Write a protein that binds this ligand. Sequence first.
Ligand code: IEX
Ligand code: MG
Ligand code: ZN
Length: 313
Amino acid sequence: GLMQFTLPVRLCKEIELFHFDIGPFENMWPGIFVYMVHRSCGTSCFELEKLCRFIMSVKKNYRRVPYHNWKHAVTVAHCMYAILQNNHTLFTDLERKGLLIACLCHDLDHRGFSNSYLQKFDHPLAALYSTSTMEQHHFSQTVSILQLEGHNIFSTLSSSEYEQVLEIIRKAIIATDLALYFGNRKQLEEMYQTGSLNLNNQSHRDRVIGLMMTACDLCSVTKLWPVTKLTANDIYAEFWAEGDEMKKLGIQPIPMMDRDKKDEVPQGQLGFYNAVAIPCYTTLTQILPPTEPLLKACRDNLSQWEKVIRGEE
Ligand SMILES: Cc1nc2ccccc2nc1CCc1nc(-c2ccccc2)cn1-c1ccccc1
Ligand SMILES: [Mg+2]
Ligand SMILES: [Zn+2]
């Protein structure tokens, strides 16, 4: 009750910034997450004992893959922490509770392969869920862990508040399917520009939380350049193994997944910043002005990839 989590001074100050990197000490990541729930939600949001047991069951259900791992989960939750803390009064008590958990759980039991690879392989998950295949799995793992004994962190909510929070989590996790992001951002663009965007309209809020989910999920492009650059190695290490597996099914993969085309990574990153990242943080900044540092950091990293192409590194 009177038991705060507290971080060393450098972490206590830098964790509040969007570009914070959670560091290589895995054993500190649970404490970092609890610190974030406590400050963004309250010391009363979750029973410490259940929250600690839930965090460790979530950790155990992330796999040892290069990129879609436990560090990614805590990293995406920290980006959400930064958004919520810079937009204090815009979010409900339930949204605060739900979104950090959603972020922590959003890639539960990821195998390092895309929805497309699961469909070409004819993985059982692709017959159980025909679209957003991994994301419906991630939500399914979240509910499994919430129903283990001593793991129900939402036990103090009413039956209707409980259903509302699980519904925020489901929509937030589904939204991390990048195939869905393009249309969600186009709609948000049009609504913001014709002045129809209405944060009391539940279907509008849903869209805004979806875009926040994309922004947190892609937040590697908003780090300091050496963090961005080293993360990109992990990202391609997964895509290239997927490419290897496509070649084993007798299918030439797309060039993004073909390790034989490493040389094109810099040009690929430009496409991605221009087509996905920049548009994402631009619309987010329009809707939530205090998230502008994410857009500024993204643009700095685009300028760094332009330098790579010009052989200035
Ligand atoms: C998905 C992705 N997600 C990321 C998430 C966070 C940070 C970095 C990320 N990088 C990528 C790869 C971004 C890319 N590389 C390529 C690529 C690379 C090498 C050879 C050929 C193509 C294309 N494209 C791409 C372009 C436009 C739209 C979509 C993908
Ligand atoms: Mg995912
Ligand atoms: Zn993710």
